Design a protein around this ligand. Structure first.
Ligand SMILES: [Ca+2]
Ligand SMILES: [Ca+2]
Ligand SMILES: [Ca+2]
Lengths: 548, 548, 195, 49, 48, 49
């Protein structure tokens, strides 16, 4: 079987329009993957300890210590938008559809190849690559999800984003329990705080091996591996955004006085004393019915502490925020809303002809207004009594704990039974698509890394590796790691991701926002005279929708 | 499958005579194609700007600037008469048949082979070619015609014309929108005219990729690719020519005086005063019924401006002419009729044992008389009144715009509702056979490059390419283009083109014109003592037919 | 010859003498294969006389043009392509709170490139022979009939059997939608007022 | 109008297919190409001529 | 009508509201309206 | 209304209705009227008006 192909390369995106404005979107993607043999054939238990950085008072946030198990296997991950759609497809989806559903997924490996490097050490010296028609590529598909879930998108180590550029997988490794203590401090702080790595707790040790828990497949050149189809069980994702905040819900006040001259500087007027109006309020001790005072059904969005690090058994970590963008973009407070920032390079969006190790990056700012503008907040004594007196107001300007740079908004939290929020929006092309759910008794209401969370089981991970190619002399009783013939593999990967979407219709007299090419961005969607490419990020929920 | 053939070489032309003088012509052609790996694996957007030539006033016509997208794929094109018929077959068709119909087409690729070059850098140094039995040739067949149509015959880059000489495909590339302005001038012109390349308009950008729009097939040595049969939908092509001009339509004038002595110098005579004749005329203010004045049903052929360049969004271009040959060959005005000129070499007709880059060429002169002889034209005042006075005649000798070298015939146009013309005739062997039709709302009545225009869809293009053969060290994050093992492919191509023709019968007492070998041309159809070949062009429509 | 340095100012190069190239041409007396000389299947768009008024039984009238927009918008010659202009008011698009009888208007410029840029045209003697000599070129700059403001492009017409063009595009919101056809024996291939 | 074109066998008038645009008294029968018919005795001309 | 599909790697031109035209699709404080003209054939297609 | 059918074909139904106001004719007869702005075209070079 050494002389014939076992597959077809396919990277077409098909749109199947069904009855009732429902679209069937089939995303074919295939790639050439290159794989080298492991540096070592054993599992290593390694600890990282950058105490040199955190030993400097006021550097707590740069903590990198952890323990991980380094495995001799590689992970083939394709969970990122860029792997399946090009800017052309994204425009069609984002401008036309109103919601997206994740249906099924499947992959395949074919046309496997294993070559061997012959070191013609002489003259230059030279190298020679020869096919080893009996060598084997090892393939393991963790279908029961025994292994820990490690989504490569998190560290931008997913499959490349160009159908015509070869790619590679990432070495697989997972976390291993450890106990760590780090006490906070600042520049002034005297002495040394407490920076200790206690070790490992016995009741939390879990050493996993692929050999012991998954059936391994041996593929030779004439072999091919296919996965069945997997059907997702997730909630639909909306491609629309809400714009109403608590201030724009319900019946506005009737204006007894209207403008008589064109110009947005000629205002209308309610025309009724603020303390003589009618309506409902949740302030029992006053008669002022203001647009900031009148009652609204519940609350859109919430306030959370910002640049807050909490600590537990293995060190400090940032407190996540699930928020939109409340606040005119020019003003914002991306910390308060927790906008994500993405760093990546060459293989996932950064200009292909660039040089150097500095990544490319961007901070995604959503369209939905479910965020907060802290500087606008304030708290006041119940006696009310305006104008409020300095002693009856806490401003995002008054210091807390004596600190001049810390607010109350800084540790404030207004999440409660009246809180309404929206899920996270897709992020093309660097975003992760789906995510496994936490196996805790009570689950989160959403995840901040991906729009689709598998309610049942997610698709298990696919691990690949080059089987050992031994020489004439091998001795099992040898501390010093043995010898293998330098071997590497090249194989084609192919996958299919099917979504189901719904076509939108016009409902307002005015046009809506739409993605479009133009004089300015034009050259971000075409190659350079040298063949340099790049994939600029786009936004997914242009197009408003009512909230209430 | 590495050890057995997947095909049969066939280059026979079969003629199947059916009932009623209808012939079924099957043209088998097969070739050995050689293919090298791409210089680069990326798509490049390149601009050409020879402003140095056009910067010289009076060189407008040498404008070469344009933008194109260079692809890493190759085009296998067989659309030219020489690929299917030898001079022997062409004589049989041209002398016997009266019309030709294009029925179907199909191709196949078999006995694929991929070798690898080993640079034995030592002593000479030497080279070594080894088979890589796992390497793959990539094949893409654009059946829906998503890609731009680029007929290689246009630049003489079609498949070779000899069954026993290996051939090659051409690198594929297509046009990319650009905006260009060039103001005309002449030697005297002072200053610098205006020669600007504005750039690209966003609303016209179309970047195409084969990977994203066509399924790619991977063939190894034991593999083979076949196309189904494609049936053309075109008008029949006539292998006959008309000779009547407006002057030879209808009933000639009755001669009251006939010659009494043999000799074409002893003329006959109508014998009736020109102003006392009977008949119809379209000159209401005179009584002269002349052979140039009497009425004819309509008009054969038309007058078009010659050596006329028009301009639009991307620069100037020549105004096409669709015309026969009106005018005794010795006299003619090939500019006025727009005779095509063909330049080619070594692989398509030029003497095989020649050396140097100067091509071979010829200007094809048709047999059909549907052309014009400008120097014969003239326009005159309606008062008539002969002999016409200099002030009442515009001659192709009087200057226009003050220019001494410009006529009125030079910008003249007599196309109208009474215009009758014929399609273009085949041109063996360098002519293109079929052509795709423009996708505009109103189509042209004919094309000047090929006799057969597909009314439906034309057969989609076939692209071929060597899949990347990587070495042990490949790094996706590398600006500087990676490294591949030098690989090349050799495969056999085979195609079948079926026409349907109709046998002619004698109808005039006299013999007709026929193609024939003779003392003079004899050696243009045989090899030299060194094995040098050449394929001289022939004409297709010898044999008259009435027009009216 | 391909570019080795990024930048649209780093051009590629055909790399073959213009008189030593291969391909097809419709100029029998020269060996120059240029991008403006090489053969193309037919012709997209056509040239028509501009600001031409013809006369018949009831007075003069403008000669219609059916054309796209050939020419970088900044440059154009809306007369040459015959772009339509629409004047209307209050009830059909003009600002409702406006006053006075002066209508509102606009000249529609299509996206399709089926137009012409006259100043780019030129005609030359068949002997070719470059650089062309003033006596063998008629430029859209040389006067006709002695008039200093009249070209040849001004009365030029390149419509013929190889002409390809497209129909008219919708014009929102002032455009007419449908139209009755002329009751003549031979009909027009299109109308310039409705799609 | 009153255009003669030439080809392989000599010059010939350029045909016109036109109606009559223009108040009859004025016209330009050359411009519209009105046909003229000459005949006699057996096809319309006065028999006793 | 017939729905379109993507065929080129790059995005295509599309009509969209923006900071500049925004107020040509809404009433004035006095109730004044207007209907600005738009173009119909944004989106290229091959000719040949 | 936009009705999406199978195969990407849309059925678009455009309903439009209006209140129309109509006054009686100035006259109940048909008039044959001629317009003659010779005053404008009497100025050489104004043919187009
Ligand atoms: Ca917003
Ligand atoms: Ca002849
Ligand atoms: Ca354009």
């Amino acid at each position: 079987g050494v002389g014939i192909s076992t597959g077809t390369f396919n990277n077409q995106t098909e749109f199947k329009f069904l009855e009732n404005g429902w679209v069937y979107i089939t995303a074919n993607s295939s790639r050439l993957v290159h794989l080298n043999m492991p540096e070592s054939e054993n599992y290593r238990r390694v600890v990282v300890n950058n105490m040199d950085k955190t030993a400097v008072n006021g550097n707590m946030a740069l903590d990198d210590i952890h323990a991980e198990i380094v495995t001799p296997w590689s992970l083939v991950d394709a969970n990122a938008w860029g792997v399946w759609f090009n800017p052309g497809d994204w425009q069609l989806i984002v401008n036309t559809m109103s919601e997206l559903h994740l249906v099924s997924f499947e992959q395949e490996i074919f046309n496997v190849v294993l070559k061997t490097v012959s070191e013609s050490a002489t003259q230059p010296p030279t190298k020679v690559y020869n096919n080893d028609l009996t060598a084997s590529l090892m393939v393991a598909l963790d279908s029961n999800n025994t292994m820990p879930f490690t989504p490569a998108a998190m560290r931008s180590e997913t499959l490349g984003f160009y159908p015509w550029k070869p790619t590679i997988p990432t070495p697989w490794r997972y976390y291993f329990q450890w106990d760590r203590t780090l006490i906070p401090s600042h520049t002034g702080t005297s002495g040394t705080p407490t920076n200790i790595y206690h070790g490992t707790d016995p009741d939390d040790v879990q050493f996993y091996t692929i050999e012991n828990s998954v059936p391994v497949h041996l593929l030779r050149t004439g072999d091919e591996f296919a996965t069945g189809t997997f059907f997702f069980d997730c909630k639909p994702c909306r491609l629309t955004h809400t714009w109403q905040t608590n201030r724009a819900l319900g019946l506005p006040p009737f204006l007894n006085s209207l403008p008589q001259s064109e110009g947005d500087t000629n205002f209308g007027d309610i025309g009724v004393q603020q303390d003589k109006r009618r309506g409902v309020t949740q302030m029992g001790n006053t008669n002022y019915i203001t647009e900031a005072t009148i009652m609204r059904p519940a609350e859109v969005g919430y306030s959370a502490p910002y640049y807050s690090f909490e600590a537990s058994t293995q060190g400090p970590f940032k407190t996540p925020i699930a928020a939109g963008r409340g606040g005119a973009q020019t003003d914002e407070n991306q910390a308060a809303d927790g906008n994500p920032r993405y760093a990546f390079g060459r293989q996932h969006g950064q200009k292909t002809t660039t040089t150097g190790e500095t990544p490319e990056r961007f901070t995604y700012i959503a369209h939905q207004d479910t965020g907060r503008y802290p500087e606008g907040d304030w708290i006041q004594n119940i006696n009310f009594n305006l104008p409020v007196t300095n002693d009856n107001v806490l401003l995002p300007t008054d210091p807390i704990g004596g600190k001049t740079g810390i607010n109350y908004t800084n540790i404030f939290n207004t999440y409660g039974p009246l809180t309404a929020l929206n899920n996270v929006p897709p992020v093309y092309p660097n975003g992760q698509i789906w995510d496994k759910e936490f196996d805790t008794d009570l689950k989160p209401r959403l995840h901040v890394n991906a729009p689709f969370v598998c309610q049942n089981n997610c698709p298990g991970q696919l691990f690949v590796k080059v089987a050992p190619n031994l020489t004439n002399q091998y001795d099992p009783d040898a501390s010093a790691n043995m010898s293998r013939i330098v071997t590497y593999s090249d194989f084609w990967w192919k996958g299919k991701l099917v979504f189901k979407a719904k076509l939108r219709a016009s409902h307002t007299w005015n046009p809506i926002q739409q993605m479009s090419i133009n004089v300015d961005n034009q050259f971000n969607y075409v190659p350079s005279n040298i063949g340099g490419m790049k994939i600029v990020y786009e936004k997914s929920q242009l197009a408003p929708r009512k909230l209430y």
